[PDB]
Amino acid sequence: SNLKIVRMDRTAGCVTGGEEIMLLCDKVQKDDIQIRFYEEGVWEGFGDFSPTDVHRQFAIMFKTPKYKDVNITKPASVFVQLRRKSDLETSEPKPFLYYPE
Amino acid sequence: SNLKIVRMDRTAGCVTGGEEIMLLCDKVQKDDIQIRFYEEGVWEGFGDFSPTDVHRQFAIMFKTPKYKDVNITKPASVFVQLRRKSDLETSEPKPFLYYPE
């Protein structure tokens, strides 16, 4: 084994294909892997991508905190950044939009 | 630097929070990182997750191939698996649904 599809941010698509998808998987080689789609006499098709599209990284599945004002009637735009606990270093912030329920 | 938010599968959420999100980032330590949300006197809030929620992995952004029958009027369910080019090893297949445009 060793090859496993940990995750796919999209499990459906238009028969026309050509839509981008982010697939997460365990250890693989960038130039020795391929995503094959098949249907059991035997149809197949492969995903379009290149060696520069495949990078090793960290993944954090977390749950969002609750904004301060629960009762807004309009989207509140704020920031989300990474922060290291030991030296409180940070990352470039990123925009995140909260909406009323 | 060194800390960077490569990706977030969701950049919006209900003010009630508590919704799961997959965030991708560069090199980090599982027990030394935190996702902080803030608003500039200074509001803040953090993402809910644990050390077992943070794993290093490979990421492949690719574009989907086009199904055989472009003209279906009903969803065609098929499989997608990983395959190594050198020995054609594979991974457990996974379900993927094609729909008519």
Query: DSSP readout, B33-89?
Result: EEEEEEE---EEEE-B--TTSEEEEEEEEEEPPPPS-TT-SS-EEEEEEEEETTT--
Residue A49 tokens read as: 């991508």
Question: Are A66 and B94 a contacting pair at CB < 8 A?
Answer: no
The method recorded for this entry reads X-ray
3-state helix, strand, coil in chain A (%, to 5): 0, 50, 50
Pairing of strands B94-99, A7-8: unpaired
Residue A9 tokens read as: 């941010």
β-strand partners of B78: B96
Q: Is B1 on the interface with A (CB under 8 A)?
A: yes
What's the start-to-end Cα distance of chain B, in Å?
Answer: 44
Let me know: does A98 contact A76? Beta carbons within 8 Å. yes
At how many Å resolution was this determined?
A: 2.7
Let me know: does A93 contact A79? Beta carbons within 8 Å. yes
Q: Is A88 on the interface with B (CB under 8 A)?
A: no
- Give the distance from CA A71 to its chain's centroid: 30
Between CA B99 and CA A12 the distance in angstroms is: 7
Between CA B100 and CA A14 the distance in angstroms is: 6
Reduced to 3 states, what is the DSSP secondary structure of residue B16?
Answer: coil
Pick among B44, B58, B81, B97 to test the A interface (most A CBs inside 10 A): B58
Between CA A78 and CA A97 the distance in angstroms is: 6
Let me know: does A90 contact A81? Beta carbons within 8 Å. yes
What's the start-to-end Cα distance of chain A, in Å?
Answer: 44
Task: Work out whether the CA dihedral A52, A21, B25, B50 comes out positive or negative.
Answer: negative
Between CA A44 and CA A35 the distance in angstroms is: 10
Q: Which CATH architecture has domain A1-101?
A: Sandwich (2.60)
β-strand partners of A29: none
Between CA A71 and CA B65 the distance in angstroms is: 45
Chain interruptions in chain A, by residue before each (C–N > 2.5 Å)? 40
Task: Work out whether the CA dihedral B12, A20, B101, A10 comes out positive or negative.
Answer: negative
DSSP class of residue B90?
B
Q: Quick count: other Cβ atoms within 10 Å of Cβ B23?
A: 22
Interface of A with B in 28-87 (CB under 8 A): 28-29, 32-40, 43, 45-49, 53-72, 76, 78-86
Nearest CA in chain B to A66: B17
Q: Which residues of A touch B35 (CB under 8 A)?
A: 60, 62, 80-83
Q: What is the C-alpha radius of gyration for chain B, rounded to an integer number of angstroms?
A: 19
